[PDB]
Every structure is written in structure tokens, then in C-alpha cells.
Symmetry: C3
């Protein structure tokens, strides 16, 4: 059964403008090299990191959206609890830590990432038996 669905679009130029700025959440998610590389809006790193950010948001949307009219239970640092990793061929998967890992124990997170020009996007479908 489907637990939740989420989609997110990210402006790659806006992302690049912010990703290496002090006073943002991004140090908690990304390395200083990643953040420096991603601060150029036409780089590989910007495109890829923006799509990773998109994927985190799509997961958060997918789970939160499953709890209509319920007080939120996602921790304030949720962005650093959801990691998008890739295998050697670039296939993505989501790794979790903290409370969300316990909430989504026994749930499969299907994710896909894409980018084009100034736009990155991701979709997440949460599925459980």
C-alpha cells in the first residue's frame, strides 16, 4: 500500500546562490567542498546537490502529507536525517536516521531525481506492506 507521495522542484540558481552562504541549514547536510562546488549555478555539483535537496523535500512531503490534520512530528533537524546516496551507476536511495527512521521502519522509499536547465526535481513514493 502507498503511505505517501511527494514531489519537489528546486531552482538551481537560487539553490546555488544560498548553498554556501553562512546562516543557512546547508552545512548540516553538505560538505564544505560540496557547498563550494555547488555555489556555481552552472556546475555539476549544483545540479546534483539541488536534486538531492529536492529529494529530501519530496520525502518530507510524502510522509507529512500522510498525516492530514495531525500535529507535525518531524524534528526541526529533519533535513539532516534524510540522506540521498547513489550507487556506482548513479541510482539513488534514501537513508534515514533519528525518529523518522523509526517511523518509516518497514516502509520502502522509492525515489527519483532529475534536472534540466535551471530546474531540479524529485518524487518520493512511500510504500508499506
Amino acid at each position: 500500500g502507498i503511505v505517501g507521495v511527494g514531489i519537489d522542484l528546486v531552482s538551481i540558481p537560487d539553490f546555488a546562490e544560498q548553498v554556501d552562504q553562512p546562516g543557512t541549514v546547508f552545512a548540516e547536510t553538505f560538505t564544505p567542498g560540496e557547498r563550494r562546488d555547488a555555489s556555481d549555478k552552472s556546475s555539476s555539483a549544483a545540479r546534483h546537490l539541488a536534486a538531492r535537496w529536492a529529494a529530501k523535500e519530496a520525502v518530507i512531503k510524502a510522509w507529512s502529507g500522510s498525516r492530514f490534520a495531525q500535529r507535525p512530528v518531524l524534528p526541526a533537524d529533519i533535513h539532516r536525517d534524510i540522506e540521498v546516496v547513489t550507487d556506482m551507476w548513479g541510482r539513488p536511495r534514501v537513508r534515514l536516521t533519528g525518529a523518522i527512521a523509526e517511523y518509516l521502519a518497514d516502509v520502502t522509499i522509492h525515489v527519483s531525481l532529475t534536472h534540466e536547465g535551471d530546474t531540479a526535481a524529485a518524487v518520493a513514493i512511500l510504500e508499506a506492506p
Copy 2:
């Protein structure tokens, strides 16, 4: 003096439908046996656990409602910080952990639980000298 008041109603059938499903907060509050037993909407466990859930919500309401127009300070995992225990005769009391235990140090939590047919309910009155 009264610090806060809260009341919550819970649909026992809706509760039973959700309590043992993956992708919910319930594993953090309830044991797998409790969750399995409570997944039948006409069982003892469903009625009792639904009323416990109701009591957690009534406590949260009672305290949050005391802070009108203030940014919330309840942690995301607040549901697992409030436990409803009973003595050998079924009398309920509330046990706290985390920040809410510190906030409600020196406050007495008066609680009552009830159920009937497809409905559980609880009321909480927080009192302090």
C-alpha cells in the same frame, strides 16, 4: 491554580485501523503486541490504547493551550514523552520525560479516560500551586 485544560476524542475504529500500520508514530508509544492486539477495533486493547492516545493528546492540548500566541515549544516526539500508566485497579496517571517533564515540574496532571462503543475520550487538567 489551573495551568491548562484539554480534552480529546478518538475514533476507536480509525485508531485500530492505523495503530499497527507501518509509517505511523505508534511504534514509539506502543509495543508490537499492544499494536497487534489493538488492530482489532472491537478488542479490549483497542479500546484501552485509544483512550491512552486520547489522554496523551488531552495533556498536549492542556499545556499548549496555556500558551496562546506563543511559538510552540513541544518537541516533535512529544507523543513518546507522555505515558499513561495505570495502577492495579486501573486508575490512570501520567508520566513525563524530556523537556515537558521540566516544564511541568511542580504541576499536577489530573487525567481521566473513558470509552464507549466506537469512541474513546480523555480529559486533562494541569494544576499548580
Copy 3:
């Protein structure tokens, strides 16, 4: 560059009425002596602690306001992660702990506190290179 700006006003009488009451966040920020002293609305402690509270709120406003249309990431216990200390001559500065310390690494927090009659106020300007 400016990361954020915040301003807060605090009613010193309302603050004094609440600061030493059970069932409030204040034990986490202030000592029992501070809280007892500050519970008289015409005392030095009330005026000073109200302005410290104002400063915490101004910092929170300054940073949160920098994230228009973004899900909040400040932890529920944010008030106890922001401390206003003073040097021997009463000049204030802000000390941080927890996630906000990481978010505001490399950001300078300029703060000022004031009080008059029944009103305390503070302003925070967050600046980053």
C-alpha cells in the same frame, strides 16, 4: 551582508507575573533565584531578565525571518539554546548551542537591549561576510 533582523517588546509586568510560575518554559532559561527576583515587576531583575527574554526572541525572529516560505528548522527548545551574557560593564552578547550554533557559525549577532517603565525591548541584526 545582513542575514536577518529581529525586534521584540516584552511587558515587564506580564513577564514578572509568569517568570516564576510552574508550567512555563522559564526554568530552562533562568535560575530559581533569577526567577524569584524577577517575579517582582518593579525589581532590577525583572527589568533585566525581561530584556534578556526580548533578546532571545529578537534573535529567533531575525533568523526565522530570513527563511520566508520555508518549513521551520528551529528546535522546540530554542529558547534555552540562546543565552544573553554581559561583560563587566553590561555590554550584551549572544551565545548559542545546538543546531542554531551550527546554522549561525560564521554569522555575527549584533544585539541591543533596553527597558523603560513597563517595557523591555531588544533588536538583533545577524551579519555574515
